C-alpha cells in the first residue's frame, strides 16, 4: 500500500551526476588509452554488466584504478559514462560504431539494442 | 541532439537497491537509537539535504559511522531509507507523524510535502 514519487529516480540520478561533475565521493578512475575518467563504482555497476562483474570480485572491488582494453575508444567511453549519469545518449553518425563497440564491451544491452536499430535504418 | 532511455533512472535505482539488499559497496552505517542501517553515502546525499551536508564536510566525509539525533525513530528512518532506494513511501496512519518528523530532520522536502497534505486531509 505504498505511494510513489514519479520524479524520485530521475532526481537521484541528477544529484549523482552533480556529485560526479564536482568530483565528490568518486572512488575509481577508469583509464581508457591516455584518458582518465573519475566515477562512482556503484553507478558504474548499476549501468554496466562489465563493471558489475569487476566490482563484485573480492580482489578488484578494492582497486582505485581500472584499465580498459586498449581497443576501447575514449570518446565512445565518455559518451557512455555521460549516458550512465543522465539517461541521455549522444548518438551520431560519426560515433555510432565506437559507441556500439564500447557498449558491447561494457555490457550495456539497451544501448547495444538502439545502436543496432539505428545502424539497420541507414 | 541526444536520445533518451525513459526507464534508465528507475533501472539504476533498482540496481542500487539490489546492491544495498546484498550489502555490496555499502560504505556507511547510520545508527538510530539501538538500530543500525547500512547504506551508500552517495545515495543518502542524493536524497537528503542533511546527508548532503554531512558527507560534503571535509572531516565527516571520512566517517564510517553516523549517529542520528536520539529523538529519531528507527521505523521512521527505515521507511525513509526504503523510499530513497525505491521511490516508494510506506505512509500509514500509525507512522505518518514519525515519518514527517524524520523527513524534516533529514531535509527530504517532497516527503515533508506529502505528509503535510495527508495530515491536512484527516
Amino acid at each position: 500500500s505504498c505511494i510513489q514519487f514519479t520524479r524520485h529516480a530521475s532526481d537521484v540520478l541528477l544529484n549523482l551526476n552533480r556529485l560526479r561533475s564536482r568530483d565528490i565521493l568518486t572512488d575509481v578512475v577508469i583509464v581508457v588509452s591516455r584518458e582518465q575518467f573519475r566515477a562512482h563504482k556503484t553507478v558504474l555497476m548499476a549501468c554496466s554488466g562489465l563493471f558489475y562483474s569487476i566490482f563484485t570480485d573480492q580482489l578488484k572491488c578494492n582497486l582505485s584504478v581500472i584499465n580498459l582494453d586498449p581497443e576501447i575508444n575514449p570518446e565512445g567511453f565518455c559518451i557512455l559514462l555521460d549516458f550512465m549519469y543522465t539517461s541521455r545518449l549522444n548518438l551520431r553518425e560519426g560515433n555510432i560504431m565506437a559507441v556500439m563497440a564500447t557498449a558491447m564491451y561494457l555490457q550495456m544491452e539497451h544501448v547495444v539494442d538502439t545502436c543496432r536499430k539505428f545502424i539497420k535504418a541507414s | 541532439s541526444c536520445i533518451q532511455f525513459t526507464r534508465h533512472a528507475s533501472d539504476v535505482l533498482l540496481n542500487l537497491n539490489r546492491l544495498r539488499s546484498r550489502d555490496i559497496l555499502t560504505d556507511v552505517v547510520i545508527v538510530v537509537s539501538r538500530e543500525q542501517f547500512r547504506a551508500h553515502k552517495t545515495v543518502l546525499m542524493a536524497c537528503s539535504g542533511l546527508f548532503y551536508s554531512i558527507f560534503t564536510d571535509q572531516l565527516k566525509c571520512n566517517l564510517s559511522v553516523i549517529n542520528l539525533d536520539p529523538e529519531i525513530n528507527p521505523e521512521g528512518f527505515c521507511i525513509l531509507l526504503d523510499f530513497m532506494y525505491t521511490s516508494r513511501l510506506n505512509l500509514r496512519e500509525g507512522n505518518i507523524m514519525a515519518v514527517m518528523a524524520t523527513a524534516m530532520y533529514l531535509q527530504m522536502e517532497h516527503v515533508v510535502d506529502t505528509c503535510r497534505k495527508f495530515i491536512k486531509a484527516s
Partner: peptide, 4 residues
C-alpha cells in the same frame, strides 16, 4: 505522488 501516485498509486503505483
Amino acid at each position: 505522488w501516485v498509486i503505483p
